[PDB]
């Protein structure tokens, strides 16, 4: 439909750019995809090492943008912003190991996986600027899959393994492993915040943008008694 199919129209020599609504300009903004505690005490990641299952659906702002599409193929600039829980920049050296699927996931801080003869590792200080690497599009698929309507494996899909539903192993790109590089326990509680800037983005199959609160990383589950409307409301349709 047109506008001089609708009203009387004047000539508007419109030079309004569409370059900021491209997939690059929409997705090449680094957003939080994971935050890793490396605390001194506690049970979170207490031994100075941490193994993060790489999953960008843990932070809802990035997750809602990517789940606009079903399939997204992209390289990603991963930036790791490490500090303390107070935000302090302490003189601590970290190893950021990309542990791909099948590679030995580090069992401890003194693990032999940290020798990283083939795994990509970033040795950075916290006093250094936030460690920044380009990861490629690493899927065995031709796109990543925020929605996998199905099951990875075959067999009787019974309810003690319904958690495999939605689990795309073409999305499981491995474990991001972070330790403090030392045989002794680190002196500082650390927070590694992971910021992913997608680049060379191709995206397929636009989806409805998630209008419920995200609850879990692997599934599109929504609170059933707390189904909010997509937007705000009003008293009557004849008023505002």
């Amino acid at each position: 439909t047109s506008d001089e199919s609708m009203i009387e129209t004047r000539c508007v020599l419109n030079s309004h750019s569409t370059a900021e609504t491209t997939l690059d300009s929409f997705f090449s903004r680094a957003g939080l995809v994971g935050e890793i505690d490396l605390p001194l005490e506690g049970t979170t990641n207490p031994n100075g090492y941490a193994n993060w299952d790489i999953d960008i659906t843990g932070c809802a702002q990035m997750r809602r943008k990517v789940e606009l599409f079903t399939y997204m193929r992209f390289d990603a600039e991963f930036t790791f912003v490490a500090c303390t829980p107070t935000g302090q920049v302490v003189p601590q050296l970290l190893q950021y190991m990309f542990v791909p699927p099948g590679a030995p996931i580090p069992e401890s801080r003194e693990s032999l996986a940290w020798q990283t003869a083939t795994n990509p590792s970033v040795f950075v200080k916290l006093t250094d600027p936030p460690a920044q690497v380009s990861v490629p599009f690493m899927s065995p698929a031709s796109a990543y899959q925020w929605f996998y309507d199905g099951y990875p494996t075959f067999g009787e899909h019974k309810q003690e393994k319904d958690l495999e539903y939605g689990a795309c192993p073409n999305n499981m790109m491995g474990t991001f492993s972070v330790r403090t590089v030392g045989s002794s326990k680190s002196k500082y509680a650390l927070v590694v915040r992971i910021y992913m800037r997608m680049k060379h983005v191709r995206a397929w199959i636009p989806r409805p943008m998630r209008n419920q609160n995200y609850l879990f990383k692997a599934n599109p589950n929504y609170a059933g008694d707390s189904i909010k409307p997509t937007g705000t409301s009003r008293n009557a349709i004849t008023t505002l």
């Binding site: 439909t1 506008d3 609708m6 009203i7 129209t9 508007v12 419109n14 309004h16 750019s17 900021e20 609504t21 491209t22 997939l23 929409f26 090449s28 903004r29 680094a30 957003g31 932070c59 809802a60 702002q61 997750r63 809602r64 943008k65 606009l68 193929r73 600039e77 990309f98 600027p129 920044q132 690497v133 380009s134 990861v135 490629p136 690493m138 899927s139 031709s142 910021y195 800037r197 191709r202 995206a203 397929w204 199959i205 636009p206 943008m209 209008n211 609160n213 995200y214 609850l215 879990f216 990383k217 609170a223 409307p229 997509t230 937007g231 409301s233 009003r234 349709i237 004849t238 505002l240």
Partner: protein, 242 residues
């Protein structure tokens, strides 16, 4: 080495900095991109897709949330009765948040261009009648009458004859872009109002239902653009994602 001088922006992590970073895999070639249907290269392709406008955004009840997608044209007293009213702002908190246009308008600060709202009559084939769908330019308040509303941009929709009209909300703005009106000083950026009026009446014979429904399908025209890509307010996370 080569004499260099670090500038103030050194060691900052700008999250929108399009920079070159070190590749973690030195000779990795990706899985070759097969052809997948439905490639979007620009988000305005989604803005131009008519998604259901929740003009009936009254029933917050969870059993009645599907009643938000459609609104009741019924048999009237034959005046210019007010059927439905919504602001024509796609990025505003209200009826447009149900649209893909409106949710993508959450991710951008400024929008420009004409909007389409397709009104789909979903009554019987035997149901007939005329609607005055009036887009009011931003200066006009809520029109008290139909005879106040047809002074604005309006379409006469015979819905028994044409089951789908499209109200093209024309881009009529002082500014070249609108920065998403709110109930405050940003009402400067209001697109105006869209009000639905019974132009004749919902005329029904015996045996066909006396109440019908209009599904409003709002989209954007091809002249529509967005700029100043921002975080969205149309969906806030409250519960932490476990």
């Amino acid at each position: 080495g080569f004499p260099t001088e670090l500038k103030p922006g050194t060691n900052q992590f700008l999250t929108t900095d399009d920079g070159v970073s070190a590749p973690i895999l030195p000779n990795f070639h990706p899985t070759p991109c097969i052809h997948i249907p439905g490639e979007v290269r620009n988000l305005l392709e989604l803005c131009q897709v008519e998604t259901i406008l929740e003009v009936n955004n009254v029933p917050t009840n969870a059993t009645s949330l599907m009643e938000r997608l459609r609104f009741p044209v019924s048999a009237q007293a034959g005046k210019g009765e007010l059927c439905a009213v919504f602001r024509a702002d796609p990025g505003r908190d209200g009826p447009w948040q149900s649209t893909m246009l409106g949710q993508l308008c959450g991710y951008y600060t400024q929008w420009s261009g004409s909007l389409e709202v397709t009104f789909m009559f979903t009554g019987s084939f035997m149901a007939t009648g005329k609607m005055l769908i009036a887009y009011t330019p931003p200066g006009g308040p809520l029109p008290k009458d139909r005879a106040t509303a047809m002074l604005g941009t309006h379409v006469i929709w015979d819905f028994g004859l044409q089951s789908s009209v499209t109200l093209v909300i024309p881009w009529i703005s002082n500014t070249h872009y609108r920065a998403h009106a709110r109930d405050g000083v940003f009402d400067y950026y209001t697109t105006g109002l869209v009000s639905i009026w019974y132009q004749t009446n919902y005329v029904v014979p015996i045996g066909a239902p006396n109440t019908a429904y209009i599904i409003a399908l709002a989209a954007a025209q091809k002249n529509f653009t967005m700029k100043l890509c921002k975080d969205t307010s149309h969906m806030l996370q409250t519960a932490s994602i476990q």
